[PDB]
């Protein structure tokens, strides 16, 4: 205690001197620079398609690089690969554990990942010799529930888990090449950078952390949220990211500035945020809420551009195509709707 | 040309046929969340019901059940408990003899009852280890009044139906613990979800007809609620 008091003080005083460094950089605010530019105005998207076929609530989804195929995970044991243009179902994968909490689609379009309370990001081979879909290999080693696993490459995948730990995996060997420790609460979301050199992850401690993939060290940690961070997504250029939380607020964080640029909050909204996503240009900021709605935000002026009100239960997941052509919205009502 | 579209539309029918078959099995089965503590005695109930997460299937009167025990996680349970917002019932097991840990179980019951995503789920309460409670009460070593001061002014309910042979002092303590859990249930959720308390021991031979009867009553009340008749 005599020496452990110093350790608390050493962390506190060093954390204190970081704040004044960030305060010096904050000369202006994002609202001041972007006040001159004209607003986007009214945004009115329409439900182009509504995908039906899931039995239980759809809990996660992911677009493909071709911006046509989707994968959606539901809490009944199915991993359905859809086709946006024709609404047809390409594949239906029965899972071992019905409580699947995440899904990912490979950039090559060959493998699909999923996982949940079974603690495994199972890899599924879509393009096999017999044409079927079978479990490629199971990546076990997490001690808490799998919350998000995303394909870094055809043979690499990063995972988040409810054991306060992220991990980089080698799908060929099946072992953790790099472990990412430092979060205190359950890690809920994960987002890769466009260059796939860094990634951010929000956890259940009201903090986000920037990780280096090839090193495994935390570059910097971002704070400002009052409650659990549920969603996270990079800005298209890769220099910023947004975070949705239970505060009913979204926050924009800049990597280089190391500060919170803007807060997207309205007094009417008192419900948590489940998913966030940017448009192709990065002007719009999509956000899925607990009040069964999706709000379009002006990322530069922090104004509600529009509302996507088409779901009966809570919006669980969101996604925007790589060409930015459409946005899809999964919900707990088991319906996946495409908006454009 | 159109061969790909014909293949794609023909393929979608094959998935659609399977999804309809899987719907029949999914709707027939009843999912149950087995929740409890280390000392509650969850494994005793699972073991005697001989028909990351552990599943237990048991068929009663040609009705498939699916009990889910979630023990491969950490003590923070506010993020994966949302995965069970549509279970038929939550089987809450408590250790009645463990006096000092009853408030911990009462707090967990209050959180599940008042959770936004679990407000619709009914709780099948199992007050496990009744024989150890009777031993502790008759021995006179530990007292409820130290841990629950309101017990000293507690009168046994009139509708009590004790087992053949039970000390009135034992019955008073047995029905006070039940009343503590039922106090939380009646304070909120008017008609949306109920609680089914049961006194059980490690030698309760069936212990599954009670779940079968409770799940039957849950579905019946759910149908009546859609008609706004109850």
């Amino acid at each position, epitope marked *: 205690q005599s020496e452990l008091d110093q350790l608390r003080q050493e962390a506190e005083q060093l954390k204190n001197q970081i704040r004044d460094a960030r305060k010096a950089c904050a000369d202006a605010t994002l609202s001041q620079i972007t006040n001159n530019i004209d607003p986007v105005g009214r945004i009115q998207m329409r439900t182009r398609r509504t995908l039906r076929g899931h039995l239980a609530k759809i809990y996660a989804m992911h677009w493909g690089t071709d911006s046509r195929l989707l994968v959606s995970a539901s809490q009944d044991g199915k991993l359905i690969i859809w086709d946006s243009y024709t609404t047809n179902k390409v594949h239906a994968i029965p899972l071992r554990s019905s409580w699947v909490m995440t899904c990912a689609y490979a950039p090559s379009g060959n493998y699909v990942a999923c996982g949940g309370l079974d603690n495994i990001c199972s890899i599924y081979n879509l393009k096999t010799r017999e044409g079927n879909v079978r479990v490629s290999r199971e990546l076990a080693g997490h001690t808490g529930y799998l919350s998000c696993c995303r394909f870094l490459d055809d043979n690499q995948i990063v995972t988040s888990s409810g054991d306060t730990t992220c991990a980089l995996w080698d799908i060929e060997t099946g072992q953790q090449t790099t472990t990412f420790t430092g979060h205190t609460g359950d890690v809920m979301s994960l987002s890769l950078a466009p260059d796939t050199r860094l990634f951010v992850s929000g956890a259940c401690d009201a903090s986000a952390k920037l990780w280096d993939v090839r090193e495994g060290m935390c570059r910097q940690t971002f704070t400002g949220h009052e*409650s659990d961070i549920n969603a996270i997504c990079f800005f298209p250029n890769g220099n910023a990211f947004a975070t949705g939380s239970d505060d009913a607020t979204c926050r924009l964080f800049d990597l280089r500035a190391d500060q919170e640029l803007m807060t997207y909050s309205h007094d009417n909204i008192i419900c948590g945020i489940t998913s966030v996503s940017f448009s192709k240009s990065g002007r719009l900021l999509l956000a899925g809420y607990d009040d069964f709605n999706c709000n379009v935000w002006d990322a530069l002026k922090a104004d509600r551009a529009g509302v996507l009100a088409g779901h009966d239960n809570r919006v669980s997941c969101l996604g925007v195509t790589d060409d930015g052509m459409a946005v899809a919205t999964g919900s707990w009502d088991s319906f996946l709707k495409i908006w454009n | 040309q159109r061969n790909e579209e014909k293949a794609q539309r023909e393929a979608n029918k094959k998935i659609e046929k399977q999804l309809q078959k899987d719907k029949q099995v999914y709707r027939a089965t009843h999912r149950l969340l087995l929740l409890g503590a280390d000392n509650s005695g969850k494994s005793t109930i699972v073991k005697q019901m001989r028909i990351g997460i552990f599943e237990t299937k048991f068929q009663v009167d040609k009705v498939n059940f699916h009990m889910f025990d979630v023990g491969g996680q950490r003590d*923070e349970r506010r993020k994966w408990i949302q995965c069970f917002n549509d279970v038929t019932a939550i089987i809450f097991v408590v250790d009645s003899s463990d006096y000092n840990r009853l408030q911990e179980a009462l707090n967990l019951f209050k959180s599940i009852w008042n959770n936004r995503w679990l407000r619709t789920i009914s709780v099948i309460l199992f007050l496990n280890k009744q024989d150890l409670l009777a031993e502790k009460v008759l021995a006179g070593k530990s007292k409820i009044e130290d*841990y629950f001061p309101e017990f000293a002014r507690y009168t046994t309910p009139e509708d009590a139906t004790p087992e053949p042979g039970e000390d009135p002092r034992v019955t008073r303590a047995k029905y006070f613990i039940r009343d503590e859990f039922l106090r939380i249930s009646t304070a909120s959720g008017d008609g949306r979800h109920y609680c089914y308390p049961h006194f059980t021991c490690a030698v309760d031979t069936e212990n599954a007809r009670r779940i079968f009867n409770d799940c039957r009553d849950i579905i019946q009340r759910m149908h009546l609620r859609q008609y706004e008749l109850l």
Partner: nanobody
Amino acid sequence: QVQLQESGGGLVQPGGSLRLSCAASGFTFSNYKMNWVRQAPGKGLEWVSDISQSGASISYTGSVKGRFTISRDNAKNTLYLQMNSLKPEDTAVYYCARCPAPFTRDCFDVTSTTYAYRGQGTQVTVSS
């Protein structure tokens, strides 16, 4: 940065009194339900008392009814716990756990070993 800094606590004879003070920062104190928890030497974390957002539900753990009383001041952004007759069994490290969500009456995981929204705690000792 969500922070909870406990105050008060120390040595006290049996039968005395001790006023705890919990200074909150980094969040809107008025929206959240606050709790007091403690960890006795050689025992796990135990819930002591909670208070509603407005300060209406003032439930206690039963072992401390009559002796302990929790207070709340949303203007000053602080939590209180006025202990009136300390017994030797009360010796524990009293934390100031805050509920996770800002508009909920249920409160989860405040007694967990690594809860993020709980303070460092203040030591309370009772001895003769």
